[PDB]
C-alpha cells in the first residue's frame, strides 16, 4: 500500500488555511498523521483518520475515507511549520514521503560574506574560500564564482539551513575547495549572489592579501 | 512519563551485525506492541519490524532474514538484531509503541546507525575573519569551518552557549567519505573586534575537542 503525499514541500502565511492530502495505493480503514520537526521523533498528531492526539490544537482537523484522506489546519501558525507524514497499518505498515510546511515570509535579500582561507588551512596546503549568503527569502537562490573574472563552478560545497524559528528566512554556505598550488595561481576571488529581490546581484570579493 | 530510550547506534562495515537496545519506562511495557521504524538521511520513514505483547513478530519481506525484533518483558527492553548491513540500512532507528488495533502513539528519540567502509577520521578546525579595517560599519559576521570528518554527526557551540540569535550552523555535506561542516554568527560592530569569540566543536568517535578563537585580520 503506497501512500502518496503531494506536494512534498509547500508554504503558507500564518492565518491561511492549509489542506494536506494522502492517497492510498488501495483502500484502508484508517489513516494516521505524524508531525516531525527537525531533530525529534515523529509525534502522533491525528489518528483513526479524525481523532486529534492530546496536545494538538483545534485548528487541526482530519477528514477522509477509503482511499483519499486530508489533514486541514484552519488558521496556519508559525508553530505548525513541520513535515507531516501520513501512515496506515491496515496491511503491512507504510508511510507517505510527507509534505513539508514552511512559513511564507516577505521577500528578503541576503547578507553575503566572503572569507579567504585561515592561516592553518593555507598551512595544510589546501585553500577553501567560504561565502555565507545569510537570511534571505525565498529559499530559491543560485550562487556562481569567478576565479579571476572567469566563471569557475568546480570544488563548490553548498549547504542550506532549515527555515529560521525567529525570522523564518533561509541561509546558505558556499565553499570553493582548490589546492594551495591552485590558490597561488590566481588573484581575484568574487561571489555572485543572484536572488529574486533585485535584478542587480550582491557581490563580495578580495584580491588575495590587502 | 512514558519514556523510550534507544542505544548502540554506531559505524560498522557492510556485512557486520549490530544490536539496538530500546529501554521503556512510565507504562506497563508487556501490555504494548513495540515496533522499530527507521528514517533514511533523506527523511523517508520505513517500518522495520513490530513484536506483539504476546511475543508474535511481524516483518515486511525485505526486512525478514536480516532483522530480529525481540523483547524483555521483565526488565522492559526492546531489541533489534541487525545482521549483514547494506548502505541502505543507514538511518535513525526509532522504537515506538502501539496498543492493539491502534497506531503507534509514542516514539523514542532514536539511535543513529551509519554503515560504510570509511574510517573514524577526526575533523580539522579553521576560523573565518574577513575585516582588515573595511566593512567595519553596521555589523560583522565571523565563521567556523570543520572539514573532513567521519562518521557523522558533530556538535558545536559559540562561547559554550552564549549566542542564540545570529548563529547559523550548516548541515555537513559529504565530498567522498569526508564530511565538511560550516557555521557562522553575526554581531553589532560594537562587540567585535572587542569581545574575541571561540567556537567549541567536539567529534563523537575520535573524541577530539580542539577550540579555536576567531583571529583578528
Ligand atoms: C507499526 C505498527 O503499527 N505495528 C503493529 C501492527 O503491525 C502490523 C500490521 C499489519 C500487518 N500486516 O497486514 O501483515 C503486519 C504488521 O499491527 C500489529 C497487530 O495489531 C502489531 O500490533 C504491530 O506492533
| Structural domains of chain A in order of their starting residue, each with its CATH number | 3-103 (2.60.40.10), 111-207 (2.60.40.10)
* Same structural domain, B100 and B145: no
* Same structural domain, B163 and B100: no
Interchain CB contact of B27 with A (< 8 Å): no
Strand locations in A5-105, DSSP E?
Answer: 9-12, 18-24, 32-36, 43-47, 51-52, 60-65, 68-73, 83-88, 94-95, 99-103
* Same structural domain, B108 and B16: yes
Dihedral of CA atoms B100, B106, B154, B164 in degrees, nearest 10, equals: 170
Helix (H) or strand (E) holding A104: none
Q: Domain boundary at B80, B115, B150, which?
A: B115
* Same structural domain, B103 and B158: no
Rounded distance, CA A183 to CA B103, Å?
A: 57
The residue among B199, B126, B215 whose CA lies nearest residue A122 is B126
The residue among A135, A108, A33 whose CA lies nearest residue B167 is A135
Interchain CB contact of B155 with A (< 8 Å): no
* Same structural domain, B8 and B106: yes
Rounded distance, CA B155 to CA B111, Å?
A: 16
Interface contact A113-B141, CB threshold 8 A: yes
Q: How was this structure determined?
A: X-ray
SS3 content of chain B, % helix, strand, coil (to 5): 5, 45, 50
The CATH number given to whatever domain includes residue B54 is 2.60.40.10
* Same structural domain, B26 and B78: yes
Helices (H), A52-200: 119-124, 180-183
- What size, in residues, is chain B? 217
User: Are B123 and B203 in contact, with CB atoms under 8 Å apart?
Assistant: yes
CA distances from A113 to A192, A206, B30, B117, B174 (A): 11, 11, 57, 36, 23
Domain that includes residue B12, residue range:
3-115
Helices (H), chain A: 119-124, 180-183
Residue A119's SS3 state is helix
Rounded distance, CA B21 to CA B79, Å?
A: 5
Q: For residue B157, report the phi and psi dihedrals to the nearest 5 degrees.
A: -160, 165
Interchain CB contact of B98 with A (< 8 Å): yes
Task: Give the dihedral sign, CA A113/A118/A121/A123.
Answer: positive
- For ligand 1, residues with CB inside 6 Å are A 89, 91-93; B 33, 35, 47, 50, 58, 98, 103-104
User: Are A150 and B200 in contact, with CB atoms under 8 Å apart?
Assistant: no
Cis peptide before A48 (omega within 30 of 0): no
Q: Which residues of A touch B145 (CB under 8 A)?
A: 118, 121, 128, 130, 175
From the CA atom positions of chain A, what is the Rg in Å?
23
The ligand 1 atom nearest the CA atom of B101? 20
Q: Domain boundary at B94, B115, B136, which?
A: B115
* Same structural domain, B100 and B28: yes
Strand B173-174, strand B111-113: pairing: unpaired
User: Are B115 and B89 in contact, with CB atoms under 8 Å apart?
Assistant: yes
Rounded distance, CA A162 to CA B170, Å?
A: 9
* Same structural domain, B66 and B89: yes
The residue among A49, A20, A18, A19 whose CA lies nearest residue A32 is A49
Interface contact A115-B129, CB threshold 8 A: yes
Strand locations in chain B, DSSP E?
Answer: 3-7, 18-25, 33-39, 45-51, 57-58, 67-72, 77-82, 91-98, 106-107, 111-113, 124-128, 139-149, 155-158, 168-169, 173-174, 179-188, 198-202, 211-213
B215 secondary structure, DSSP code:
P
The ligand 1 atom nearest the CA atom of B33? 24
Q: Which residues contact A80 (CB under 8 A, 6 or more apart)?
A: A18, A59, A60, A73, A101
* Same structural domain, B16 and B103: yes
B214 secondary structure, DSSP code:
P
Residue with the smallest CA separation from ligand 1 atom 8 is: A92
* Same structural domain, B90 and B138: no
* Same structural domain, B58 and B146: no
User: Are A127 and A179 in contact, with CB atoms under 8 Å apart?
Assistant: yes
Q: Which residues of B touch A98 (CB under 8 A)?
A: 43, 45
- In DSSP terms, B94 is beta-bridged to B37
* Same structural domain, B18 and B103: yes
Q: Domain boundary at B115, B146, B162, which?
A: B115
Rounded distance, CA A113 to CA B130, Å?
A: 8
What is the number of structural domains in chain B?
Answer: 2
The residue among B43, B36, B115 whose CA lies nearest residue B83 is B115
Interface contact A98-B141, CB threshold 8 A: no
Q: Which residues contact A122 (CB under 8 A, 6 or more apart)?
A: A180, A183
Rounded distance, CA A93 to CA A91, Å?
A: 6
Rounded distance, CA B119 to CA B150, Å?
A: 7
Amino acid at each position: 500500500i503506497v501512500l502518496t503525499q503531494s506536494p512534498a514541500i509547500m508554504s503558507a502565511s500564518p492565518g491561511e488555511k492549509v489542506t494536506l492530502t494522502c492517497s492510498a495505493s488501495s483502500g484502508i480503514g484508517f489513516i494516521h498523521w505524524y508531525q516531525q520537526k527537525p531533530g525529534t521523533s515523529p509525534k502522533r498528531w491525528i489518528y483513526d483518520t479524525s481523532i486529534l492526539a492530546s496536545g494538538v490544537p483545534a485548528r487541526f482537523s482530519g477528514s477522509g475515507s477509503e482511499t483519499s484522506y486530508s489533514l486541514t489546519i484552519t488558521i496556519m501558525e508559525a508553530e505548525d511549520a513541520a513535515t507531516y507524514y501520513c501512515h496506515q497499518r491496515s496491511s503491512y505498515p507504510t508511510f507517505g514521503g510527507g509534505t513539508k510546511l514552511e512559513i511564507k515570509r516577505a521577500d528578503a535579500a541576503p547578507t553575503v560574506s566572503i572569507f579567504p582561507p585561515s592561516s592553518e588551512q593555507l598551512t595544510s596546503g589546501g585553500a577553501s574560500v567560504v561565502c555565507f549568503l545569510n537570511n534571505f527569502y525565498p529559499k530559491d537562490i543560485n550562487v556562481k564564482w569567478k576565479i579571476d573574472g572567469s566563471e569557475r563552478q568546480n570544488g563548490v560545497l553548498n549547504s542550506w539551513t532549515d527555515q529560521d524559528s525567529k525570522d523564518s528566512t533561509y541561509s546558505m554556505s558556499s565553499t570553493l575547495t582548490l589546492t594551495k598550488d591552485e590558490y597561488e595561481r590566481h588573484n581575484s576571488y568574487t561571489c555572485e549572489a543572484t536572488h529574486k529581490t533585485s535584478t542587480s546581484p550582491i557581490v563580495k570579493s578580495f584580491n588575495r592579501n590587502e | 512519563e512514558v519514556k523510550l530510550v534507544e542505544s548502540g547506534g554506531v559505524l560498522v562495515k557492510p556485512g557486520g551485525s549490530l544490536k539496538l537496545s530500546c529501554a521503556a519506562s512510565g507504562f506497563t511495557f508487556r501490555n504494548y506492541d513495540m515496533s522499530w521504524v527507521r528514517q533514511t538521511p533523506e527523511k523517508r520513514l520505513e517500518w522495520v519490524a513490530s513484536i506483539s505483547g504476546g511475543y508474535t513478530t511481524y516483518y515486511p519481506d525485505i526486512m525478514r532474514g536480516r532483522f530480529t525484533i525481540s523483547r524483555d518483558n521483565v526488565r522492559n527492553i526492546l531489541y533489534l538484531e541487525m545482521r549483514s548491513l547494506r548502505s541502505e540500512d543507514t538511518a535513525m532507528y526509532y522504537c515506538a509503541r502501539n496498543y492493539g488495533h491502534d497506531a503507534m502513539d509514542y516514539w523514542g528519540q532514536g539511535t543513529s546507525v551509519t554503515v560504510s567502509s570509511a574510517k573514524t577520521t577526526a575533523p580539522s578546525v579553521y576560523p573565518l575573519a574577513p575585516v582588515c579595517g573595511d566593512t567595519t560599519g553596521s555589523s560583522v559576521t565571523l565563521g567556523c569551518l570543520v572539514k573532513g570528518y567521519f562518521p557523522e554527526p558533530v556538535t558545536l557551540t559559540w562561547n559554550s552557549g552564549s549566542l542564540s540569535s545570529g548563529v547559523h550552523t550548516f548541515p555537513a555535506v559529504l565530498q567522498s567519505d569526508l564530511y565538511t561542516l560550516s557555521s557562522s554568527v553575526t554581531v553589532t560592530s560594537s562587540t567585535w573586534p572587542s569581545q574575541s569569540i571561540t567556537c567549541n566543536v567536539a567529534h563523537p568517535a575520535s573524541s577530539t575537542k580542539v577550540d579555536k578563537k576567531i583571529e583578528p585580520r
